[model samples]
Target: GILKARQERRLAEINREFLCDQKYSDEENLPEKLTAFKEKYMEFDLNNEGEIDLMSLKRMMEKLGVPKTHLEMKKMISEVTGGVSDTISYRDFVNMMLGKRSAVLKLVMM
Candidate 1:
């Protein structure tokens, strides 16, 4: 119970630092990036559903040159849903992107 709360808090902190920023960049604006992401998300939604399935996520990741093991990808996707979602929603996709960028940023800063 305590651990889950800590994890949630930690995720929130990461989000505030990266996803909540008003301006990401002039060259790579968040609004424009989000629009592009929506279009890409639609392309990835193979079933024409409102969300992306596990297979679609795997395919998209590989096509983007962000390959991961099955287990690793599963775990990463689960972070968006807290393990309660079978598919990734548009909001979740944004979160995933921001989360990934945040981690990279942290590494570079370190």
Candidate 2:
């Protein structure tokens, strides 16, 4: 129970601090934003594996000026992966940036 509560609290914090929906309002600029996001993801995909792990995520966040702790990163990864994986695929990463958790679920279902 305690662990579940802690995870919930951490998820709340992650949503507030990292996953807020400030960027999606500008529909006109979304494609440009997606292109930019893709470039950033490619930059961190060091192994050319089309996915990024925790360390790469940390570095990407650092570059964006919001360096997080190890625990915070883990929480963010868990948030995106729904606790199923440690790495973030480009599709998942884009959905995260778009603040589209439901879309992630839909993609997972498909």
Candidate 3:
């Protein structure tokens, strides 16, 4: 695509932002955060397809200010998919990054 210089720069900014997780701060509940990001990231997976290819994922990450090299991108995607597929379904992606488990904890005294 012939993106204008400004647009190109903007895309770069987006890539940096997302790569650093500037959108949201780190939390103890990793899965929840992954789920939160997926809620928004799924939009890029056009056709409402359950999974996203590497190229699509790169664009999505770029648009979100996240920078990732080919290998890193693939690794991150793998982290999101538990090394199952290049294309990760939203459900599976969220689970892999942040598996199911309650965040809350109970206290007891011995």
Candidate 4:
């Protein structure tokens, strides 16, 4: 029980340190925001393969404090990939972030 609490607190710290939210009300800074977002995406692209796999996705989401089950993670990937691939490319990741696409998955950026 103590361990669980400690782990949860650690996750919260990660969320505060890493998760970048779209809190800017001005539209002019969007390009800057996109650059920051891209950097965040590249951080999770550990192998520099230009894509994020299931495990990487889980790690990113967990660090952002939005953990999901494996099944739900698969669903999120499928939603973005149209069931054609199990990995997410940078373009699709951008789309998801901008809310330009993705119906089943939305990041809690607030």
Candidate 5:
């Protein structure tokens, strides 16, 4: 598949980001990355169907505390659905996550 390359690269980028941000050196960071992916997958697999659909993606993104009006979301649906509708496949989610990524993690200072 054409996207297989992008997917692999994207996953690597995610692993890199998590490892760097979490301050877990080498082996320690790799495990943490795997654990984080598992946690995120659990959140997405709402019905425990072992697979995620568009609505589940929506819920998962919400659970991540990102605003629903994410530009990435709009772009994902458009590209994945061929400009017909707003539906994000699992692979599509991966693409959107890596390409044009942003983290709006707001920190409140006391």
Candidate 6:
């Protein structure tokens, strides 16, 4: 019973953490931040196709000081796009950076 209680308490802590343990900042600002980010990064979109391929992502990430190796890029792209395409839309890019836990979280954390 002691071990079971301890485990239950631990699980409760984890649930709390996943739900709301961290506060990045205001949720309202994420849309604005995404707009600004898009303006800044859109120049690199090159083809103006409204999406960026792996090569474009690599270039942008390099400039942003988050350069990834080929393996890293592949893994990230696969995860973000669910292996559906070689490109990532700007929204997916934002979601990837912040994770899908929540939209506003990405802006503050990123």
Query: Per-prediction RMSD in angstroms?
Result: 12.0, 15.1, 13.9, 10.5, 10.3, 16.5
lDDT of 5 by residue, 1-110 (tens): 43444444555565565556533443444655454554444444333333444565567667666555556656545754456545544334333333344322111000
| lDDT string, candidate 1, 6-107, tens digits | 534443444445445654543356555555555455555343454667687677677767766777667666766777887666666666555544432112
Local accuracy of candidate 6 as per-residue lDDT tens digits, 11-68: 3443344334244244456545445555544445332354667676677667767757
Residue-level lDDT of model 4, residues 60-106, one tens digit each, is 77887887899988988888877888887655655566655645555
**Segments in model 4 whose C-alpha atoms lie over 4 Å from true places:** 1-30, 45-48, 102-105
Off by over 4 Å in 1: 1-33, 95-110
In model 5, what are the clashing residue pairs, if there are any? Answer: none
TM-score of each: 0.50, 0.51, 0.46, 0.57, 0.34, 0.48
Q: How far off is residue 88 in model 2, in Å?
A: 0.8
Better of 1 and 3 by lDDT: 1
CA lDDT, candidate 3, residue 38: 50
Of candidate 4, the 10-residue stretch with the lowest lDDT total is: 10-19
Winner by TM-score between candidate 4 and candidate 3: 4
**Residue-wise lDDT of candidate 3 within 1-110, one digit each (tens)?**
33334433443444344446633344465444544545454455432343567777677768767676888767766656657777665455433434453211000000
- By lDDT, the best candidate is 4
Model 1 residue 83 distance off true place after TM-score fit, in angstroms = 1.9
The number of the candidate with the highest TM-score is 4
**Clashes per candidate (backbone, < 3 Å):** 0, 0, 9, 0, 0, 0
After superposition, the stretches of candidate 3 with alpha carbons farther than 4 Å from their true spots are 1-41, 47-49, 97-110
Over 1-109, each residue of candidate 2 has an lDDT whose tens digit, in order, gives 5544443444344334433356555455665656665555555623335466877777777776775788877777787877788877666666666664553222332
The TM-score obtained by model 3 is: 0.46
Instruction: Give model 1 RMSD, 1 decimal.
Output: 12.0
Residue 10's lDDT within candidate 5 is 54
Q: Clashing residue pairs in candidate 6, if any? A: none
**Residue 7 error, candidate 6, Å:** 52
Whole-model Cα lDDT per candidate? 0.56, 0.59, 0.50, 0.61, 0.46, 0.53
